[PDB]
Amino acid sequence: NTASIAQARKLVEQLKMEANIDRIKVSKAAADLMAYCEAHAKEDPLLTPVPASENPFR
Amino acid sequence: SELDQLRQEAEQLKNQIRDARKACADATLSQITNNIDPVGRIQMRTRRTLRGHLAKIYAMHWGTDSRLLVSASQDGKLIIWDSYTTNKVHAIPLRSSWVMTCAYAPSGNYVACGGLDNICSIYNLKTREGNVRVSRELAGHTGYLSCCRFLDDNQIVTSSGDTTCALWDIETGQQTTTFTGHTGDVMSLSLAPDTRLFVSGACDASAKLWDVREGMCRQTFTGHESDINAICFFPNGNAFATGSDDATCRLFDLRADQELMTYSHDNIICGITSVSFSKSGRLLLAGYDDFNCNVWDALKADRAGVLAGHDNRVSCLGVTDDGMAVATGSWDSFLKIWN
Amino acid sequence: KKILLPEPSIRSVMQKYLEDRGEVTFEKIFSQKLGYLLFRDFCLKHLEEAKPLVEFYEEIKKYEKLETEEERLVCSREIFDTYIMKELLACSHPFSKSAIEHVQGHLVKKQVPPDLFQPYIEEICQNLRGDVFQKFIESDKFTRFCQWKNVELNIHLTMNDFSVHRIIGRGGFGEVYGCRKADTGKMYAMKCLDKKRIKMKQGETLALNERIMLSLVSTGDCPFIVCMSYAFHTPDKLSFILDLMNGGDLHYHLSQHGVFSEADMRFYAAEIILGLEHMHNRFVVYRDLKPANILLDEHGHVRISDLGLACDFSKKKPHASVGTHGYMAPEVLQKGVAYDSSADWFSLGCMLFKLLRGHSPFRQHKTKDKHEIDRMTLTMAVELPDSFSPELRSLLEGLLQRDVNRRLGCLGRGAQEVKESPFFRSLDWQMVFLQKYPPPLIPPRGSFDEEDTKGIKLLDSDQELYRNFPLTISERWQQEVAETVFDTINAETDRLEARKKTKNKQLGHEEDYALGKDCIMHGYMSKMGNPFLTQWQRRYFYLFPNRLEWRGEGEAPQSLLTMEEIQSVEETQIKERKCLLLKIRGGKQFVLQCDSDPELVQWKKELRDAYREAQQLVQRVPKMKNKP
């Protein structure tokens, strides 16, 4: 299994595909998340409760 | 020795990946979200109580109409509820008692479920004659079915205790693609919103990103210290959240290829069974093994709410596509709808 | 208080009870009386392939029983033309060339013995053993089998199961009454031994032994031994249910009538021999053969009764001196000196002597001198009155010859040697067996009691020796039932069922709950409900691999236990009623009472099996196991 030469080679070729992707700064990734949340918070019933009127469970 | 050569080459490649990631860590999510306003507290209270299952509940799924949901129980049945009325629409005796997961398809035409039988079974809801039968038995896995999600009415994706995930062609029952790479039982999967990628969480404490169509693993996230039991995409396909026996949920960014946040507290010790984001992503809800569901603020990490009306484990939960509601299902035979 | 079959649901538990035990084979079921009865009702009526074979089995069976040679030529022709020739003429003979060639050749040689078609018997069996047998098991007829077996395996008898009548016999340890088993009507003797009177005279082995001896010789349906159908007890009494003989014993009748002629003695000796054969064939010696242990039935035929002093020689053979005094052989009386069949043959001699000439040949002139009768039997043969014919003379000296290896019966062919004596030259031995000979004596139609002797105790250490006395002889019970209530109970129960199926295509509830899933076993049990009250409620249960569900009549199940919850499963007593005690995780307890011993046995077994597997399974499934 790990005695397998084919398995060791498969593994190495995988870590290759994973080592060679494009990355972005976290600073960046964090902003786009924050952005999304703002863009859609007025659309999100759990974030800001809407009155009995529209909510089906009352 | 060439076997020895490949062992180092994989060791140095993990280092290459470790350094490449640190090189992107120029800032934290917690820094970047420091001045945006809190959420307040989330007044969430039981609305409906879905009464029926005669034993522990293991799993549930909302239909896309944000109204129906399927649930799966130790009692050997699926139950399809209309949550507005609490009326059972269908009750389904399974052929194996050892069911463990279930899924409502997006069209509302089919559900799937499975478990210790190592099979994903597709049930059809309205046939020509108009009654509920097994339309397929997707066999091929060599270990329990842990989770399953439809892409549409003819393809479905499953995860298993055999450490693989798989893609199926329902019309022919063929196992068209096979996703290997995990080294422990796979527990949970989540589909991206485009359905071209999905993520898996496993008992090897690693989660993985997969490409549906090309059949390979694009990315591996780690850092949990224990079984990942649950996984869910952030509503924009660019990150996901995981829950684990380590008593923490985490947020991993896809494009930064790494962990952004831990959600945890010193006085929470039980493991997590289930995770879901609210519609906008701000709220991360987690079902816990101390009988509660927690609402976290995804962006800040502060604990923001509690859902507490179950006398046993919250095994599963779910938010509707319309953001209006949360199901929690429990080892105490009950589902509850909250808002 | 008549027999009541369980409902057919009983099939779920019984088919598994039997299967665990290896009993669902053609061999085991076909050789049971009610088993054969049901399997053939199935073949003849509910399957056109098997009908021929069974009809053929039966014609051959009837053929074996024909008495005359005249009758067998006529019949063998009929059978061959009907079940063999005609079948070949239309290419549907599934039998050996060997089997046809056996018969063909005998018939044209006009040869017709009762075992003529024996080789078809094996081959008809092989033709039924396979597909027909499996299709039988599919049928409602095997359901009916399970229903009748549930009753068999659930028999527990008490004096109340019998309507006891008047005294017909008595000895040291108790009395025999005649009686009627209410169940079925069947008439029987009931022997009743007082346990206290036993303890005192200190013969528990002796009571125990009679039961064990009865149980060795009681199959076979032998007309010349008084056999056992059941045995049970109470705190106070042992009970044997034996063949009813209400014509008294020979001792009485001998003293009544006087001594017997030779032709009249010829009759008693025949019938007695056949019983001896039977016992000897089952490796049993009687040892106490004497006129008083020969009972006459209502017409005059006799039987050997009372196996108290009998003994098994299938392994160790007896050495010790046992029996009455002028009937004990030499090898008997020599302690240390072993023996077997030998002594009966001797006794027979003394016994037959005594019927002709009024006293044991070794009881000289009214003497009541044990050690005299002993010592003369040891080393002196007897001038047999000049009046005995040569043939009787020959017989008696054959039987009484002191040396075991020059004595009749004990020269390696047994009863056969005795049947060949000139004394029985005139007898046809199948007509003796069939009781077709006229008995000399027809018993004519209709303060011995026990003073309360001893204030003795009956301990837990006493009642432990009789732990294994209770028993039922299956072949007896089935035979009893076959010929009394079997048909009327079967049709009554057919109606009871066919009506309830009609009432369910009305009242809604049909589509069967157990079917289609992974249900392991279902059936009725009762639980306590009301905790503060504790009365039993009967429900229908369903065992799945990870839970136990039940429901009342009408609505589907609304309660259960999980195999996960269950920690242990053990027997317990409630109201002197054996129940199952389930201990549950909370410290809680759950009590189950089943309706018959097989059900208790199987529910205990499958529950234990289910929960052990469920727990070993669940602790390798992260989403199912308990976490710390």
Ligand SMILES: COc1cccc(OC)c1CNC(=O)c1cc([C@@H]2NC(=O)NC(C)=C2C(=O)Nc2ccc3[nH]ncc3c2)ccc1F
């Ligand atoms: C039963 O225990 C043993 C065991 C060995 C020897 C022995 O003799 C002392 C004994 C004691 N026998 C008895 O006590 C006993 C003996 C008898 C009668 N006495 C006797 O010597 N022989 C016989 C044949 C007796 C007798 O009448 N038995 C009997 C049996 C079956 C029957 N069916 N229909 C009638 C009928 C009658 C009746 C009842 C008894 F309880």
